[PDB]
Structure 1
Amino acid sequence: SLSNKLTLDKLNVKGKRVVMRVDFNVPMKNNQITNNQRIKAAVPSIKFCLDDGAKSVVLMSHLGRPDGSPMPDKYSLQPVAVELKSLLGKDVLFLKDCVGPEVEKACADPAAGSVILLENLRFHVEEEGKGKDASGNKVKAEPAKIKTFRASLSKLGDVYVNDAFGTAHRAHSSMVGVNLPKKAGGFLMKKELNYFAKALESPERPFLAILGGAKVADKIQLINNMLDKVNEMIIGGGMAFTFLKVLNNMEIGTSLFDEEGAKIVKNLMSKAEKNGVKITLPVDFVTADKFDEHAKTGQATVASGIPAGWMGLDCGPESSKKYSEAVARAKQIVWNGPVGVFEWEAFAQGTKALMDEVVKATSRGCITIIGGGDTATCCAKWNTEDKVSHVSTGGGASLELLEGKVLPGVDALSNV
């Protein structure tokens, strides 16, 4: 997607200060980084700069959603400075702010090979452009203030590099507001985009897409677009029940149901048929008397229906077989969302078996792409991240792409 945009590999950073937007918005538990995949995924771009004789490297990102309110005790990027220092083996200068005189002078003529990490960009309402004040009232940013903020960020360097794929879908100040003669996309951006371009412009055939999750309404455009590129599609998780109900008139008990999505199901099937797309739905399920990790377990099939008062939380053995059948024929796979409540061991077996199949397919030459989010965390708790072709570092961003949208984060990049 950047074949028409400027990239790091085509930039000259010798003796220059580099302002690099990155995505260090990692998850925490109480004071520790539960997952540092996002930090490690940006190192390749940081080193390339340093190894190429860079005067300095200024990194900026956000953490959570403070709403433009300084919350150092809740969303401080300080702990990320400690984590980075160890992964880089180099010293990192952390600043209590990301804009202002003090920061601006600190980033002017610094000691060569200097790594500087700025503070949460969202501690200012100028980043997103909106937020709230102490009074609790929702406020809007001033065009004059926005220009100032964007102007301060631009003074931090000579060239600008964007490697925040996970934030590529946001049209915030640090993503599209930096005013510098050169805006280059990082390696992480080049890598992530290269995989999704393969599964969006010219995939290997057969091409299979596995879509799970809970709701259907917020997935309509994702399915609609994918129905123009895939050969086979698996509809699993709570999503399936909305299709079985409208398509087979099957009873679903107290299982998840999407009223809004139920009205489009028939239009989705019609599009698949016209395009020659095979849609695999589950044939049996693992039920529960209630929504609880320690609920009573049962079983059911499409033909028998789900008993009243019960609900399907995972697929069954026969469904696992069909899924594997589709996985075996594929030459490329895109997976987004679990096919069952994987957070509870008793209902994660269906997702576990599919992962095993997906892992075996990769070792046979199949291109396997797992979209970030709930389906990304799985592989982590399974240590099967290096058992597939690619695990995305951006769920909401990769979703935007799959829907066929344009990420403001890359469009704002310099042309070539």
Structure 2
Amino acid sequence: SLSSKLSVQDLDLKDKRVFIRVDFNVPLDGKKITSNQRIVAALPTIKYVLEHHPRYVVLASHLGQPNGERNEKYSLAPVAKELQSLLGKDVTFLNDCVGPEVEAAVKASAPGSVILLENLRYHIEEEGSRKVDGQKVKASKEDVQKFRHELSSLADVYINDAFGTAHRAHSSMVGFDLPQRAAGFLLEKELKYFGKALENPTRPFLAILGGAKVADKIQLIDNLLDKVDSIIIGGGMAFTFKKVLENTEIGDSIFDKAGAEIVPKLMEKAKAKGVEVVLPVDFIIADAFSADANTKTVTDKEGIPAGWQGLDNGPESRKLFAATVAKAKTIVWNGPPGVFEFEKFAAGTKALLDEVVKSSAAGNTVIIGGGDTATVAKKYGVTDKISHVSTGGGASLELLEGKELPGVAFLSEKK
């Protein structure tokens, strides 16, 4: 159970050597943080720990893709400075995550110190491999164990707060053999929500899916079909389901050739489980993929003329989706119903967004788990209205498509 794991909140931190794997993978531009969102998100854990007077707090993370080689372009130095400002406490920055220098520095620290180590991925043994000439140069089991040995040396307790990496069995996610591997407030939140949704869902459990390709979400639908009561399929995804199941004439809309092969299968299953599949009955077409393109509403039956392409949810579909949402007690949403980047094609997304929020207002569990689906919530400033906007990215998907997460499995049980 994603929900049975140990929390930071259960740990006895006093005078302990705490190690926290955090997600400080922020965007840099010329060695400067374009977005400090991730640093800000990590603060609660860091602050809660510090209040219990640990001997010291070692923070580690990765940034960009150094590729197991020391590359200045992906140094965590800037991050160290932003955190010091944001935290309002000094942060010692070490040029590495392992070695005598680190050991020394760490050992000479003052109580309550906050050490941030250099980019874990400067070492090939973190990921356990490296790309050289396109091929995957794997690291030797001995070196991998050495690295994990050195890393663990620095701590007495281990806290994971990097959900975004929990789906990889990297040295920092699964190499800490301590008696207590706990969850940080950040990752606990993801575990609590996705936990309920996938374990004891308050039916009806609905799932809104949308976006561009169906091919990337084949494993997602399949698994969810064993879970949900009804599922809505919107966006550029729906065009494949409609041309296949209903012979709908789609114009120059998104068609996933490979995904069309599976559509009958997922549908057979949907029926098998008695899952209610809601699809778009009408769309807003455009003569070109641009904010300045001529629109025109058409429907299921009228179809879409050649040249034209549907870029948003039509009026009837909005009524249809609004209804479905309004009947659910648990909602997990990933993917916008239309090309919301353009105001002309933003109606469907807005309509849906309002409904979901209203459902959250009702006191229903709404879980956003999409990149652009979170951006939508941020844009309309409703983020605080959604029960949970996940930050797991690839980990969130994998979790939803069935997979068991190494970083999560490795944690201790509540006790």
Distance 1:41 1:309, change over 3 A: same
Q: Which amino acid aligns with 1:196?
A: F
TM-fit CA distance, 1:185:
1.8
Partner SS for 1:14: coil
8 Å contact from structure 1 (residues 371, 391) kept in 2? yes
Aligned to 1:203: 201
Partner SS for 2:362: coil
TM-fit CA distance, 1:51:
0.7
Partner SS for 2:203: coil
Aligned to 1:104: 103
Partner SS for 1:314: strand
Aligned to 1:391: 389
TM-score for both structures, normalised by structure 2 = 0.94
In structure 2, how many angstroms separate the alpha carbons of the residues matched to 1:105 and 1:12?
Answer: 25
Aligned to 1:337: 335
Q: Which amino acid aligns with 2:82?
A: E
Q: Which amino acid aligns with 2:79?
A: V
8 Å contact from structure 1 (residues 293, 344) kept in 2? yes
Distance 1:32 1:293, change over 3 A: farther
TM-fit CA distance, 1:243:
0.3
Partner SS for 2:158: strand
Distance 1:332 1:64, change over 3 A: same
TM-score for both structures, normalised by structure 1 = 0.94
TM-fit CA distance, 1:29:
4.8
TM-fit CA distance, 1:394:
1.0
Partner SS for 1:234: strand
Question: Residue 188 in 1 paired to residue 186 in 2?
Answer: yes
TM-fit CA distance, 1:147:
1.8
Distance 1:201 1:2, change over 3 A: closer
TM-fit CA distance, 1:399:
1.0
Corresponding residue to 1:168 among 151, 166, 169: 166
Could you give the per-residue CA deviations for residues 46-103 of structure 1, whole angstroms, max 9, x where no partner exists? 122111111111111111222112222x222222223322332222112222222211
Distance 1:171 1:403, change over 3 A: same
Q: How many residues are matched?
A: 414
Aligned to 1:88: 87
Aligned to 1:22: 22
CA RMSD of aligned residues (A): 1.9
Aligned to 1:39: 39
Q: Which amino acid aligns with 2:323?
A: E
Distance 1:261 1:319, change over 3 A: same
Distance 1:287 1:79, change over 3 A: farther
Aligned to 2:112: 113
8 Å contact from structure 1 (residues 37, 393) kept in 2? no
Aligned to 1:63: 63
Corresponding residue to 1:376 among 364, 374, 377: 374
In structure 2, how many angstroms separate the alpha carbons of the residues matched to 1:127 and 1:261?
Answer: 35
8 Å contact from structure 1 (residues 57, 116) kept in 2? yes
Could you give the per-residue CA deviations for residues 110-168 of structure 1, whole angstroms, max 9, x where no partner exists? 201111111111111111111245x8875321222212221221122221111111111
Corresponding residue to 2:316 among 315, 318, 330: 318
TM-fit CA distance, 1:407:
0.5
Distance 1:369 1:12, change over 3 A: same
Q: Which amino acid aligns with 1:21?
A: R
8 Å contact from structure 1 (residues 372, 396) kept in 2? no
TM-fit CA distance, 1:7:
2.7
Partner SS for 2:348: helix
8 Å contact from structure 2 (residues 2, 195) kept in 1? no
Higher mean displacement: 372-381 or 188-197: 372-381
Distance 1:29 1:327, change over 3 A: farther
Distance 1:412 1:272, change over 3 A: same
Aligned to 2:276: 278
